[PDB]
Design a protein around this ligand. Structure first.
Ligand SMILES: [Zn+2]
Ligand SMILES: [Zn+2]
Ligand SMILES: [Zn+2]
Ligand SMILES: [Zn+2]
Length: 121
DNA sequence: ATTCTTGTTTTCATATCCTAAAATTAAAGGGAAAATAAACAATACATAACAAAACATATAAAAACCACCTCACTAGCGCCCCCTGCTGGCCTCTGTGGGCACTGCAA
């Protein structure tokens, strides 16, 4: 485990994908990459029978599509609710990240440093 | 008639032999002190026999040493999710762009 861990600092990727440029830190990530070229798909969502490449994708599918009463995530800055955490990530990166050079209002001279305040104005 | 050699008994003579008294001298006999020898008895040394102590061999008696087996630890590499975060389309809801019909005002 520690031998495998040290590549997280160094960056060694001693496992090459013979069919593309990808290179993984350990055996499992390479075996998981192989399904995309071979097209093998061992796992199956038992409810809708929709097809997926990856187990975790299926688990998130079940959680968002065939599950009830699941907790959501509220943006701290704005008042909108959205389902997935990673989409809350992309929301904070595209709308509430600090914009260095600023953006000016289309109709007045006021300049803003966050896209949210701009759209709100 | 007178003178001269030669042979044979007589008688002193001078060495020898015999005779006996001295002396004497060595033998020989006895008294006695050494004295070597010898017979016997004692001591010390050497040899042989018996009994015991010391040395060497066998054996087995614990006992020590070495090697193998075995039951673990130590590495080793996948194996398998699993969770978490970024990424790249996707789509639909606001929002950017525009054509154009419509109206209020004042000729
Ligand atoms: Zn590949
Ligand atoms: Zn499903
Ligand atoms: Zn927000
Ligand atoms: Zn403005």
């Amino acid at each position: 485990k520690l031998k495998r861990h040290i590549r997280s600092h160094t960056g060694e990727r001693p496992f090459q994908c013979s069919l593309c440029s990808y290179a993984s830190r350990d055996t499992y990530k390479l075996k998981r990459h192989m399904r995309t070229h071979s097209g093998e798909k061992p796992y199956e969502c038992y409810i809708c029978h929709a097809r997926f490449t990856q187990s975790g994708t299926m688990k998130m599918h079940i959680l968002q599509k065939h599950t009830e009463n699941v907790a959501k995530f509220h943006c701290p800055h704005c008042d909108t609710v959205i389902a997935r955490k990673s989409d809350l990530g992309v929301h904070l990166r595209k709308q509430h990240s600090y914009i260095e050079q600023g953006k000016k209002c289309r109709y007045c001279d006021a300049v803003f440093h966050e896209r949210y305040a701009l759209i709100q104005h």
